[PDB]
Design an enzyme around this catalytic site. Sequence first.
Site, PDB file in Angstrom:
ATOM      1  N   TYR A  51      -0.545 -10.960  -7.211  1.00 27.01           N
ATOM      2  CA  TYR A  51       0.702 -10.403  -6.701  1.00 27.01           C
ATOM      3  C   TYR A  51       1.277  -9.430  -7.721  1.00 27.01           C
ATOM      4  O   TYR A  51       1.661  -9.825  -8.824  1.00 27.01           O
ATOM      5  CB  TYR A  51       1.720 -11.504  -6.384  1.00 27.01           C
ATOM      6  CG  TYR A  51       2.053 -11.625  -4.915  1.00 27.01           C
ATOM      7  CD1 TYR A  51       2.897 -10.702  -4.293  1.00 27.01           C
ATOM      8  CD2 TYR A  51       1.535 -12.664  -4.147  1.00 27.01           C
ATOM      9  CE1 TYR A  51       3.210 -10.808  -2.941  1.00 27.01           C
ATOM     10  CE2 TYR A  51       1.842 -12.780  -2.793  1.00 27.01           C
ATOM     11  CZ  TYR A  51       2.678 -11.849  -2.197  1.00 27.01           C
ATOM     12  OH  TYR A  51       2.983 -11.963  -0.859  1.00 27.01           O
ATOM     13  N   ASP A 197       1.319  15.571   6.808  1.00 26.69           N
ATOM     14  CA  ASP A 197       0.412  14.440   6.946  1.00 26.69           C
ATOM     15  C   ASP A 197      -1.037  14.935   6.877  1.00 26.69           C
ATOM     16  O   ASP A 197      -1.693  15.104   7.904  1.00 26.69           O
ATOM     17  CB  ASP A 197       0.690  13.733   8.278  1.00 26.69           C
ATOM     18  CG  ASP A 197      -0.090  12.442   8.447  1.00 26.69           C
ATOM     19  OD1 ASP A 197      -0.965  12.129   7.612  1.00 26.69           O
ATOM     20  OD2 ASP A 197       0.178  11.736   9.440  1.00 26.69           O
ATOM     21  N   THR A 223      -4.159   9.512   4.434  1.00 28.14           N
ATOM     22  CA  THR A 223      -5.024   8.344   4.383  1.00 28.14           C
ATOM     23  C   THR A 223      -6.110   8.619   3.351  1.00 28.14           C
ATOM     24  O   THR A 223      -6.431   9.777   3.071  1.00 28.14           O
ATOM     25  CB  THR A 223      -5.679   8.040   5.745  1.00 28.14           C
ATOM     26  OG1 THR A 223      -6.453   9.166   6.176  1.00 28.14           O
ATOM     27  CG2 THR A 223      -4.626   7.720   6.794  1.00 28.14           C
ATOM     28  N   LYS A 226     -10.520   9.048   5.331  1.00 23.23           N
ATOM     29  CA  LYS A 226     -11.086  10.105   6.173  1.00 23.23           C
ATOM     30  C   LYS A 226     -11.995  11.050   5.369  1.00 23.23           C
ATOM     31  O   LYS A 226     -13.023  10.609   4.846  1.00 23.23           O
ATOM     32  CB  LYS A 226      -9.984  10.841   6.949  1.00 23.23           C
ATOM     33  CG  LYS A 226      -9.281   9.962   7.984  1.00 23.23           C
ATOM     34  CD  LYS A 226      -8.158  10.698   8.696  1.00 23.23           C
ATOM     35  CE  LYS A 226      -7.493   9.834   9.764  1.00 23.23           C
ATOM     36  NZ  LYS A 226      -6.792   8.641   9.216  1.00 23.23           N
TER      37      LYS A 226
HETATM   38  C1  LIG Z   1       7.725 -16.184   3.176  1.00 21.71           C
HETATM   39  C2  LIG Z   1       7.153 -14.829   2.863  1.00 21.71           C
HETATM   40  N1  LIG Z   1       6.902 -13.946   3.897  1.00 21.71           N
HETATM   41  C3  LIG Z   1       6.377 -12.692   3.645  1.00 21.71           C
HETATM   42  C4  LIG Z   1       6.085 -12.307   2.340  1.00 21.71           C
HETATM   43  C5  LIG Z   1       5.527 -10.921   2.099  1.00 21.71           C
HETATM   44  O1  LIG Z   1       4.127 -10.878   2.232  1.00 21.71           O
HETATM   45  P1  LIG Z   1       3.327  -9.588   1.697  1.00 21.71           P
HETATM   46  O2  LIG Z   1       3.430  -9.553   0.191  1.00 21.71           O
HETATM   47  O3  LIG Z   1       1.880  -9.707   2.118  1.00 21.71           O
HETATM   48  O4  LIG Z   1       3.932  -8.337   2.285  1.00 21.71           O
HETATM   49  C6  LIG Z   1       6.334 -13.187   1.280  1.00 21.71           C
HETATM   50  C7  LIG Z   1       6.025 -12.764  -0.133  1.00 21.71           C
HETATM   51  N2  LIG Z   1       6.241 -13.523  -1.081  1.00 21.71           N
HETATM   52  C8  LIG Z   1       6.351 -13.063  -2.458  1.00 21.71           C
HETATM   53  C9  LIG Z   1       6.037 -14.192  -3.422  1.00 21.71           C
HETATM   54  O5  LIG Z   1       6.201 -15.361  -3.065  1.00 21.71           O
HETATM   55  O6  LIG Z   1       5.619 -13.960  -4.559  1.00 21.71           O
HETATM   56  C10 LIG Z   1       7.731 -12.464  -2.780  1.00 21.71           C
HETATM   57  C11 LIG Z   1       8.875 -13.476  -2.721  1.00 21.71           C
HETATM   58  O7  LIG Z   1       8.028 -11.377  -1.892  1.00 21.71           O
HETATM   59  C12 LIG Z   1       6.870 -14.456   1.549  1.00 21.71           C
HETATM   60  O8  LIG Z   1       7.121 -15.340   0.528  1.00 21.71           O
HETATM   61  C1  LIG Z   2      -2.989  12.443  10.720  1.00 24.70           C
HETATM   62  C2  LIG Z   2      -3.011  10.940  10.751  1.00 24.70           C
HETATM   63  N1  LIG Z   2      -2.048  10.235  10.055  1.00 24.70           N
HETATM   64  C3  LIG Z   2      -2.038   8.852  10.063  1.00 24.70           C
HETATM   65  C4  LIG Z   2      -3.010   8.151  10.770  1.00 24.70           C
HETATM   66  C5  LIG Z   2      -2.960   6.639  10.771  1.00 24.70           C
HETATM   67  O1  LIG Z   2      -3.622   6.081   9.662  1.00 24.70           O
HETATM   68  P1  LIG Z   2      -3.959   4.507   9.659  1.00 24.70           P
HETATM   69  O2  LIG Z   2      -4.997   4.239  10.723  1.00 24.70           O
HETATM   70  O3  LIG Z   2      -4.498   4.131   8.298  1.00 24.70           O
HETATM   71  O4  LIG Z   2      -2.704   3.720   9.951  1.00 24.70           O
HETATM   72  C6  LIG Z   2      -3.994   8.849  11.483  1.00 24.70           C
HETATM   73  C7  LIG Z   2      -5.040   8.087  12.254  1.00 24.70           C
HETATM   74  N2  LIG Z   2      -5.913   8.682  12.892  1.00 24.70           N
HETATM   75  C8  LIG Z   2      -6.687   8.056  13.955  1.00 24.70           C
HETATM   76  C9  LIG Z   2      -8.008   8.777  14.145  1.00 24.70           C
HETATM   77  O5  LIG Z   2      -8.108   9.961  13.817  1.00 24.70           O
HETATM   78  O6  LIG Z   2      -8.987   8.196  14.621  1.00 24.70           O
HETATM   79  C10 LIG Z   2      -5.924   7.991  15.290  1.00 24.70           C
HETATM   80  C11 LIG Z   2      -5.639   9.361  15.907  1.00 24.70           C
HETATM   81  O7  LIG Z   2      -4.685   7.288  15.129  1.00 24.70           O
HETATM   82  C12 LIG Z   2      -3.991  10.252  11.469  1.00 24.70           C
HETATM   83  O8  LIG Z   2      -4.946  10.960  12.156  1.00 24.70           O
END
Ligand SMILES: Cc1ncc(COP(=O)(O)O)c(CN[C@H](C(=O)O)[C@H](C)O)c1O
Ligand SMILES: Cc1ncc(COP(=O)(O)O)c(CN[C@H](C(=O)O)[C@H](C)O)c1O
Lengths: 405, 405
Positions: A51, A197, A223, A226
Site C-alpha cells: 500500500y 487525450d 493510456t 496502446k
Molecule cells: C474499507 C475500505 N474500502 C476501500 C478502500 C480503498 O481501496 P483501494 O485502495 O483499492 O482503492 C480501503 C482502503 N484502505 C486503506 C488502508 O486500509 O490502508 C486506506 C484506509 O485507504 C478501505 O479500507
Molecule cells: C482516447 C481514449 N481515452 C481513454 C480510453 C479508455 O482507456 P481505458 O480502457 O484504460 O479505461 C480509450 C479507450 N479506448 C477503447 C478502444 O480504443 O478500444 C474504446 C474506444 O473505449 C481511448 O480510446
Amino acid sequence: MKYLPQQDPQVFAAIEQERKRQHAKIELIASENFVSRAVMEAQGSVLTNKYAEGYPGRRYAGGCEYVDIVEELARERAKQLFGAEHANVQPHSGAQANMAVYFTVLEHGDTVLGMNLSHGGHLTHGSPVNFSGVQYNFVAYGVDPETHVIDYDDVREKARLHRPKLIVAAASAYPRIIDFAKFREIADEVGAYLMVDMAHIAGLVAAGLHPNPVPYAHFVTTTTHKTLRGPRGGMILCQEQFAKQIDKAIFPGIQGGPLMHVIAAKAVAFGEALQDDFKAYAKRVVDNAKRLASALQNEGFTLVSGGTDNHLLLVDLRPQQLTGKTAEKVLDEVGITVNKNTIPYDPESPFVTSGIRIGTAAVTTRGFGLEEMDEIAAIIGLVLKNVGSEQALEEARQRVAALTD
Amino acid sequence: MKYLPQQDPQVFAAIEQERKRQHAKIELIASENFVSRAVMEAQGSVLTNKYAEGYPGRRYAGGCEYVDIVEELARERAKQLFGAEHANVQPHSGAQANMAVYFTVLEHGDTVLGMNLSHGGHLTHGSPVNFSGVQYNFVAYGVDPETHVIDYDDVREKARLHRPKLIVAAASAYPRIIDFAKFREIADEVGAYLMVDMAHIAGLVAAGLHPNPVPYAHFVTTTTHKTLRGPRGGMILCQEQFAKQIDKAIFPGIQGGPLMHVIAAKAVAFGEALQDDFKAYAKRVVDNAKRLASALQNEGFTLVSGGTDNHLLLVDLRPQQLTGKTAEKVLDEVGITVNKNTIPYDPESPFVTSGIRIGTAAVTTRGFGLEEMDEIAAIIGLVLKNVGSEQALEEARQRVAALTD
Ligand SMILES: Cc1ncc(COP(=O)(O)O)c(CN[C@H](C(=O)O)[C@H](C)O)c1O
Ligand SMILES: Cc1ncc(COP(=O)(O)O)c(CN[C@H](C(=O)O)[C@H](C)O)c1O
C-alpha cells in the site's frame, strides 16, 4: 509459469488458450498491442503487496522507500519522453486519467467541449451513458462530412456559443493528425482549459511522428497500453502549476492505493520507449498503416478521411453494402480480429455501424512489414467481397495461418 | 525473473530491494497481505494485451472467447464464496467499486449516511477531499466514546433525521464485528439502500468468522487484496435485481477496459479462498490478532474497544503520551511496519493522530503463530516505553531480525 498450473488448472488452461490465440490470429484492434516480457515480469512482481497511498516521499504508510524509487523512475522517464513539467503515473486506466482532470478543473454541471462520439470521439468525452456526460454538460464538435477531418471552424463556433470551461481534443477512431495549436488558439479566445487525450497516439508522439500536445495543452491524459506499448493503465501529464491539484485529484480525490506493480511496468515501458529501436518501431507502425490504407483502396475499399496519418484507419463499408457488425463477424471466422466502429455521419446505430476500425500497432510488434500489409489487405478483400462463399473463407483461413508462421 | 534484469537494471534493483524488504520487516499494516506465486503469475500474463470492454459473451471487441472464461471463473467463484446472486470483478480498486455503487443508486448531491472517518470510516465514505464527500451529501454516525463500538441508536437517529438515500456500513479501522442485521433494520425504516464495504473483513467473511453482509445488504463492495489475500483490485456483490445496473455503472459508467490479467488473479485468489486451508489460515489471523491484543494489554497498552473481534486492532497511545506519528517513526527504525491512525474522538489531527493500526493478516501468511504474537507485542513495548534509548532500539532490531529468520 510454474506455480499456477498446479494451483489453478482451470485458469491456467484459459490463459494458455489466450496465449495461443494471440499468436494464431491477426490482431488489428487499433487500441491493442503486445507487451515485452520485461513489462509482464514487472506486473507479476511482489509490488502488489504494498500500500503506497500518496506520492514518493509523501506517503501515508511506512515501508514505501523502494516503491518510491519505482514511481519516480516512471514519472521522470515520462517527463523525459514527452517533455512535460509534471507526470502522474497512478491512474488505474485512461478513464480514471480523464476523470481526475475533470475532477480538478470542473464543478458538476460545467460545460465541456469534446469530439463527437460517432465522428471519432471517446466514451469519456461526453457519452450520456458515461460519467462524463452525466456529471458534466458536454457539447460536441464534428468533422467535415466530405473529408472527415476535424472542422476547426466548428470547434471555434461551438466554443464561442456554449462557452465551455474545458475543451477536450483527441479521439478513439480518428486517422488524421490533430492540430493542437488550433485547439489552444480557440481555447485562449473563449478562456477555457485545453485537455488532450493522446491515448491512441501516445507512442507516435514519443517517437516524434505526431505533434506533441504538451506545449499546447494545460492537461494531457493517456493510456500506457496502446501505441506506447506498455501495461494496462493511465497517465496524466501537466504543467507545474497544476501539479499539486492533479495529484490531489488522483489521491485522495478519485482513487486510493495505486498499483505499484503496474507503475513498475510503466517505468519499464517508458524505458523501452526512450530507446532508439522504439522510434524505428513506431515509424514502421505508421508506414504499415499507410501501406495497408493504400492497399485496401487498391482492393476497392473507401476509407474515412481517404487514408491515414497515424496508426489506425476506418473502412467505410457502405459501398459494399455491409455493416461493421457483419464485417466483424465474418473476419472473426477467418482469424482476423477487428472491431465494428461508427463512421462519421453513420446511418446505423453504434451497435451495428457502417465501418470497421483497423490498427497496425500490434502486428508491427510481431514483425509485420509492408509486404504483410499487402497480404492482410488482400485477405480482407477476399472475405468482404465474397461473404456468402465458404470456399473463399477457407482460402482466407489458410492465408491467415500462413502469415502467423 | 529473466527478461527484466537485462532490460531494466534500475527497476529490477528497486523490485529486488522491495522483495528483500518484505521478508526482512515485520509487516503489520492491517490492509496488507502476501499473495501466492500463482496469483502473481496470473498478473504477469499476456492477458494485459486484451481489450475486453463489456462482459462475458456481451463484449464490444472480438477475440474475448478465453478471457470470458477467466472472468466467469472469477464471478462464479466469488458467488460460491459469499453466496451472492451477482458478482462484478471488474472494479480497478475498492475506490472504484464504491464509486460504481454510488453512481448506480444516487444522483449528485444526494444524502448518504456513512461511518465517521475519525471513528473508523473510510475515505470513500464521505471525505470532503474525496469524490464521495464532494459528489454526495455525506452525514456520519459514530461510535460510543467509552466502548468504541458503533452506536446503533446514533445510526438510527442520523438516518431518521437526515433521510439518506443510501446507508454505508463497514470501516478501515474498526476492530469489532459489525451488526449488518441492525443496519438493514434501520435502512428499512427510513427507506434507504444498504451498502457494506467489507474490504477489510472480506477474507474473514469467506471463512465464516465474520457475519456475511450479503443476505442483509443490497450492495456489497470489497477489495481483493486485504484479508481475502488476492491481487490489488475491487469487486461488487449484489442481488440479481441490481445486476444489470451495477454492470452498466462499471462499463460504460465509470471505467473502460478491465484488467483481465488482474481478474485472472482474482479467480486464482477466490479459488485459494474456497480451499479448506484458507479457512484455517483466517482463523489463525483472528486468533493471532486476539493474542496480540491481549499481549499488548499485558505490556500496558490501552486498545480501542478494549480488544478485537477481527484481523486488526488500534492502540490508544494517549496513556504513553505518544502520537501515532511518533510511534510509526520509531517502529520503522527497528523494522516494524505500522501506520499512524486516528482513534475515535482523537484530540490530534489525522496527520499526527493518537494511535497506531495493527493487523495480523500479513504475518499469519508468513507462518507467525501465537508465540510470535507475544514477541511482537514485547518488542513494541520495549520500543514505545523507551523511545529515547538507542540501546533498547538496537535490542529491538535484533529481536525483529530473529523473528524474520
Ligand atoms: C474499507 C475500505 N474500502 C476501500 C478502500 C480503498 O481501496 P483501494 O485502495 O483499492 O482503492 C480501503 C482502503 N484502505 C486503506 C488502508 O486500509 O490502508 C486506506 C484506509 O485507504 C478501505 O479500507
Ligand atoms: C482516447 C481514449 N481515452 C481513454 C480510453 C479508455 O482507456 P481505458 O480502457 O484504460 O479505461 C480509450 C479507450 N479506448 C477503447 C478502444 O480504443 O478500444 C474504446 C474506444 O473505449 C481511448 O480510446
